[PDB]
Amino acid sequence: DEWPGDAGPPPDGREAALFVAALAAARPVLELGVGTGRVAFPLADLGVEVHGVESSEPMLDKLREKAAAHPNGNLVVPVLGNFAKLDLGEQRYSVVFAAFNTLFCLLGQDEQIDCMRQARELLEPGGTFVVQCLNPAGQRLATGNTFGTVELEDTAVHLEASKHDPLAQTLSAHHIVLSEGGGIRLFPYRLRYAYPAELDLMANVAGLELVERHADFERRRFDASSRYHVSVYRAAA
Amino acid sequence: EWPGDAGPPPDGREAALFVAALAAARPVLELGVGTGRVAFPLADLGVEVHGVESSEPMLDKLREKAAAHPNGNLVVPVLGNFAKLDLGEQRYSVVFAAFNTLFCLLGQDEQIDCMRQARELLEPGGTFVVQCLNPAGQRLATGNTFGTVELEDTAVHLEASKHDPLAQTLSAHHIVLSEGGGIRLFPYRLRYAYPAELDLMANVAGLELVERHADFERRRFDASSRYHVSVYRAA
Amino acid sequence: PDGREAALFVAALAAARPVLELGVGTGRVAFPLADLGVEVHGVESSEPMLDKLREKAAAHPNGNLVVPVLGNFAKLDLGEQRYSVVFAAFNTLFCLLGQDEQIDCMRQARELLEPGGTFVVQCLNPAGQRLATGNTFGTVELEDTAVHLEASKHDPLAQTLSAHHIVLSEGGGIRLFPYRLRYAYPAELDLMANVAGLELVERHADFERRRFDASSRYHVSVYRAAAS
Amino acid sequence: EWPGDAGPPPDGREAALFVAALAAARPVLELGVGTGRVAFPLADLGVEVHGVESSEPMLDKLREKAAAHPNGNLVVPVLGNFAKLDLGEQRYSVVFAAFNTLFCLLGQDEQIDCMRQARELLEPGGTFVVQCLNPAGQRLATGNTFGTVELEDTAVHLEASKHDPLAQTLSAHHIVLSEGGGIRLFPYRLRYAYPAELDLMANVAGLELVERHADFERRRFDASSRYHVSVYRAAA
Amino acid sequence: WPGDAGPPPDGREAALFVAALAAARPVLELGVGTGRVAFPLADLGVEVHGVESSEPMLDKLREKAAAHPNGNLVVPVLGNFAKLDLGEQRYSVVFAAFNTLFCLLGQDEQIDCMRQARELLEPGGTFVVQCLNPAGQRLATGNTFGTVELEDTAVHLEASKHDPLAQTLSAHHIVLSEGGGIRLFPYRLRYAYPAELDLMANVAGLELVERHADFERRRFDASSRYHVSVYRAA
Amino acid sequence: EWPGDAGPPPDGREAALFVAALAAARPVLELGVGTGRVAFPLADLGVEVHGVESSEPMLDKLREKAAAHPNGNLVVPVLGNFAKLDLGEQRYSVVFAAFNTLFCLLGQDEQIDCMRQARELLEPGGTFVVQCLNPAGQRLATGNTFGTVELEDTAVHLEASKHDPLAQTLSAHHIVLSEGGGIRLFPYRLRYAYPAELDLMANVAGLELVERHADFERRRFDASSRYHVSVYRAAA
Numbered sequence A: 001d002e003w004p005g006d007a008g009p010p011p012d013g014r015e016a017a018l019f020v021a022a023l024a025a026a027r028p029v030l031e032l033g034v035g036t037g038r039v040a041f042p043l044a045d046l047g048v049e050v051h052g053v054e055s056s057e058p059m060l061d062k063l064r065e066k067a068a069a070h071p072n073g074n075l076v077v078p079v080l081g082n083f084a085k086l087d088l089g090e091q092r093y094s095v096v097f098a099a100f101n102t103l104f105c106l107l108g109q110d111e112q113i114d115c116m117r118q119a120r121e122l123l124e125p126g127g128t129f130v131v132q133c134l135n136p137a138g139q140r141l142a143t144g145n146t147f148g149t150v151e152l153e154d155t156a157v158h159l160e161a162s163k164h165d166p167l168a169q170t171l172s173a174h175h176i177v178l179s180e181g182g183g184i185r186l187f188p189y190r191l192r193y194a195y196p197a198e199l200d201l202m203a204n205v206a207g208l209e210l211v212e213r214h215a216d217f218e219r220r221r222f223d224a225s226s227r228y229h230v231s232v233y234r235a236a237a
Numbered sequence B: 001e002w003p004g005d006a007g008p009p010p011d012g013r014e015a016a017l018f019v020a021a022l023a024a025a026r027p028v029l030e031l032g033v034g035t036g037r038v039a040f041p042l043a044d045l046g047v048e049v050h051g052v053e054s055s056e057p058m059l060d061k062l063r064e065k066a067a068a069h070p071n072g073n074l075v076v077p078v079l080g081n082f083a084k085l086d087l088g089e090q091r092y093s094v095v096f097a098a099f100n101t102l103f104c105l106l107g108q109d110e111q112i113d114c115m116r117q118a119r120e121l122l123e124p125g126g127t128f129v130v131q132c133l134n135p136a137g138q139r140l141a142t143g144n145t146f147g148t149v150e151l152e153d154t155a156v157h158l159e160a161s162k163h164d165p166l167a168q169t170l171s172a173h174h175i176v177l178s179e180g181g182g183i184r185l186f187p188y189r190l191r192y193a194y195p196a197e198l199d200l201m202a203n204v205a206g207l208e209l210v211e212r213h214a215d216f217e218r219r220r221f222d223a224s225s226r227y228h229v230s231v232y233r234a235a
Numbered sequence C: 001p002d003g004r005e006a007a008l009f010v011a012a013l014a015a016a017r018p019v020l021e022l023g024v025g026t027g028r029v030a031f032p033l034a035d036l037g038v039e040v041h042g043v044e045s046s047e048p049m050l051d052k053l054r055e056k057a058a059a060h061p062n063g064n065l066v067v068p069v070l071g072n073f074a075k076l077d078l079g080e081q082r083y084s085v086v087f088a089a090f091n092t093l094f095c096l097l098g099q100d101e102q103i104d105c106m107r108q109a110r111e112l113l114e115p116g117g118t119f120v121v122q123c124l125n126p127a128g129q130r131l132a133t134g135n136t137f138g139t140v141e142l143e144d145t146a147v148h149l150e151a152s153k154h155d156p157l158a159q160t161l162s163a164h165h166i167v168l169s170e171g172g173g174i175r176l177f178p179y180r181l182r183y184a185y186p187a188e189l190d191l192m193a194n195v196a197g198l199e200l201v202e203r204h205a206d207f208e209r210r211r212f213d214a215s216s217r218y219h220v221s222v223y224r225a226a227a228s
Numbered sequence D, F: 001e002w003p004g005d006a007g008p009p010p011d012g013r014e015a016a017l018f019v020a021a022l023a024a025a026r027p028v029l030e031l032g033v034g035t036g037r038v039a040f041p042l043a044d045l046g047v048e049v050h051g052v053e054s055s056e057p058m059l060d061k062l063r064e065k066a067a068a069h070p071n072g073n074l075v076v077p078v079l080g081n082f083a084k085l086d087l088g089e090q091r092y093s094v095v096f097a098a099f100n101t102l103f104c105l106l107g108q109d110e111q112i113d114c115m116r117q118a119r120e121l122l123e124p125g126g127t128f129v130v131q132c133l134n135p136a137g138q139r140l141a142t143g144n145t146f147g148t149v150e151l152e153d154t155a156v157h158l159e160a161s162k163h164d165p166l167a168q169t170l171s172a173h174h175i176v177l178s179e180g181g182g183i184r185l186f187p188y189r190l191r192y193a194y195p196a197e198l199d200l201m202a203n204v205a206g207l208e209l210v211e212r213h214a215d216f217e218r219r220r221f222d223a224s225s226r227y228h229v230s231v232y233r234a235a236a
Numbered sequence E: 001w002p003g004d005a006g007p008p009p010d011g012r013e014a015a016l017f018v019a020a021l022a023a024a025r026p027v028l029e030l031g032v033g034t035g036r037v038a039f040p041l042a043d044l045g046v047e048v049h050g051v052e053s054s055e056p057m058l059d060k061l062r063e064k065a066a067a068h069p070n071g072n073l074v075v076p077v078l079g080n081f082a083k084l085d086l087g088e089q090r091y092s093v094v095f096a097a098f099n100t101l102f103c104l105l106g107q108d109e110q111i112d113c114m115r116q117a118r119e120l121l122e123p124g125g126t127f128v129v130q131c132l133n134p135a136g137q138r139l140a141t142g143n144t145f146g147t148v149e150l151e152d153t154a155v156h157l158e159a160s161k162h163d164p165l166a167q168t169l170s171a172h173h174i175v176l177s178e179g180g181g182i183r184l185f186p187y188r189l190r191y192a193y194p195a196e197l198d199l200m201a202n203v204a205g206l207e208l209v210e211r212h213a214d215f216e217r218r219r220f221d222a223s224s225r226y227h228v229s230v231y232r233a234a
């Protein structure tokens, strides 16, 4: 959205879109955690109908505003709510996806399994479930507390204070912005991450099976040093 | 026979006490019986141990130590790879795998199969016990490492290993260099799991966690613990 | 957050005689002690911080058990009074910025113990604190509308730590709380204790008696009059 | 201006002595004269200093301390560009850039150019002297870092930096947080060169290395020195 | 020599890369070795002139050449990277793979080799090198000891001294084998950083035309362990 | 006799000059004299050295180098443990322990006892000199480590060690692996003390610190110094 450099959201909106589109089957897709449409609008540019779920009202409001002004806004269907509770009806989708750690916003393994399962049940035959998550091995997370520089601007610095518990597999952090004036903005967040093999087992429990894993949306080889992965799951035979 | 950290952990007695307390004058099954590191101390506690192994040789050194032991009659050696081995009607109050035995199985799938079979050999109320290295607390570098395992007056014990954080395997050689110039290499392989993955494996296998400690003396388990001792029940 | 636990620890050693807390604060140890029926004489050098204590004591259902004293750790005149326990929690002893002052402090404490009395200290453990040489910056804690950070300078020769506890708030507000320490290593500390007529009888990681080892961030050490 | 490690390095006098020893009672040119941390000390020694800055602002502040300094008249403020500028026929016994000034030019090319201009401003047997961070000894982490620079009773100085070890650049903010709630940010960029690269650059610019030290007191230079002071002269 | 103990498995890829630039004229490989790249190039119909200073290794090449279906495309040349007289013969490509250039223990020698190389290029010709990338290799200051590779009956280890000022690596590849055997294989390199290397190239009358992480043309960045750089005559 | 870093420190001569400046026409006592790395340079300055060892092997080898040395009559070898050796009426202007000798005693208590024995052997104004690793500057990892000490054409020198930071002990093997398959292990143990601890030990033994350097050439001691040379005198 606004934040510059590494402080902003991952600059791969376009690539995510292409990726999902290629899996879309000219039919409609569901984005879990659609925010302000970082992936949804590029999707709309490729002629893909995107229903987007988002729990943050201020964010969804913005998506709606931008949609009104977007040449292809009409391909974007904003859905306000908590995914676990929304009744999406008889609607099925060709692709359900969750970009930039959205799945890991659910603060436990059981919640994540449940989520994968709701997504499974919304797929049409042959549909896929796609997630993009931090890859703990490649991310080399230190145990305990850390503090680091995220990005610099002429008149502000973006920093991060973080707490990592490698046993519970949680991260709790503030994104911090300090400004020349003396202003300070804190943006708290929390993740529970999964390791790839744990994640794959969760998917099985949820009735899903892994069909492919990459490091990123351009399909680069995934390996131990990959900071992220993009995983694609199908319903199990 | 290897000194300090080279040899196996010195918790054999304590393992026994922990397993014993969990058995109701009913037989217990150790996976990967050794030279009876745990088993024999169990007998000293009046507990019948059925030990599984796939090494006709090692199993033979066990038979021998069973003949010389004042309680060897309680130690029953079962030869054969656990995966393919049928124990028919016989059930157990406890089934346990000590010092990373479970992680000798080189895959999540095979590990879940082992946990399942273990569940199907538990009587009502029986428990499945594992002692595993705890990745978070073991601080394992990615890729290759080389370290000192232990020193003796006339030899050093070293370790060359490869760690693959995705497959979660450790493949290593325990190396002994001796003053005369002799060299012995002892290779070995593990696939480990994180606690939360292990608990989900246990569930898929029909088990549920009922307690976790850092060791057999029941010390508090936390992030910095090098091992955990986990106890599971049927669901 | 071990106020209670430190109190339980000290109380278990104090029997029914009075104890002396060096660096009584707003009484985060003293009051839980009173609630346990222990009489606490608390020392401090800041007449201001003593006041905040006196105010809380008046409003506490057991504040009569807390006796505020004004003086200096190393150099005090309490006269004939002796204690079953003299203690110094959360790094108090390392507030004295030198080995000599610290030894002098330990000697006073020894001279104020009755027979069988114990001197107890809680101190950061350098091995387990894994302190980098030079300057560091770190995260201490997170809240919804503020972060607690720490900036510090470490001189591994002088064994000193100079730091600011930093609080940053959504407003743009910043509070800085500076502090200084001279720490000792366990073996140094034990030898200092010997020089002061004390000997170590037990060492734990914490007031719950958890095992102390190299990775322990703190230790709780219990000293008594030296033998022979 | 600022306390301790937050302020500028405390080797002004020493840099002056070092330079004056090489200055043959003839004039010296300081690139990045700043506020005269070195120039004035040089003036105190009887040495004429022509100091160059790019920003009129800083020159003005220099012109002001000069007017209030007992030996300020020996410090000539010059406005120009390190790589390109016209000083005509004036030559110098010493041309120098202290505390990383050379690395303020953001590329190998501009650094060579500057070294060359310097060479051409030297008199016969004149020297070109630079003081630069020494990467090996500085142990710079890849990527981003955050650190404490200095403490004060009512404020803290921190540093947030981005290091690109491939472009060999450092991009930082010096940050001052105050008990008030005030925050001051002071940006800066550097492009560094390793010693072997630097000497080759000098060669390409017509200079050859004649001596290298850790500091202006001539302490031994080695892999663990955070800085070097290098002395060049025009090549055969 | 298994896995990471052995040489890099990019022989074919190297050849393809070099072939693409070769345009039906001869190429010169500095440090031709045992033909790890030369032969794969011969399979592509490219004439290879391979240079080496070690007669021994040069002999082994000759032997594998006579037994290769395309050996006659591999012309072994005894000589010295920096200094050697090849007459009027010119090449479309002169390349040095896997750290060959860093085998010369000094910046000056390395510049001399680059210059000699430039002077053997026809018009439009190119000089290609493959070099460890210090930034991406994250080299500890001072001594280190590490595991290179494992085998069932032996371990491959490495002891090294890194001098970050001289930019040198001095190491022993160590083989320990069951039964008491020890083999030491010492080697020395002087590396250059990219920006230094490029300036070296300019001094040698060469200019950089492209840089990759490897012979497959993957993007080069700070975390790339190696780089493949292609230069033209100024 | 071992190459580079495997061999002993090359500061024998410097150690002798430093000790001789403190000596005073009345013998010095070296604890752990080994094969004379310091005793002989000392004899070249006409200083009489009484050298203590327990290892009869090196004492037999010292005697042999001393019979073939032009000034061997100045090197008096004394066989046996220090803790047990009663040296009688003889007093010394200097007692010293180079390269970690004091840390060969495996406990704070033994070390204090040694220091005390030294104090009692000093003449009035006499001094006790020690050279010991400096923990702050050595940055010793906790637990086990393995590293390269040195390289030669046909052999590598390695080290496997166990560091206990609470007990402040190092137990290690210097390992030499040779091209033919040869393996030599050389075990050793130390218990070190931090400077402040060491000074307090000195006090307990009736000594007071009068000077501290990084080395025998009197370089400044600081956090980054790998060693220190400390000079103690008797407490008035």
Ligand SMILES: [Li+]
Residues within 6 Å of the ligand: A021, A022, A023, A024, A025, A026
């Ligand atoms: Li599609």
Ligand SMILES: [Li+]
Residues within 6 Å of the ligand: B180, B181, B182, B183, E179, E180, E181, F180, F181, F182, F183
């Ligand atoms: Li051998």
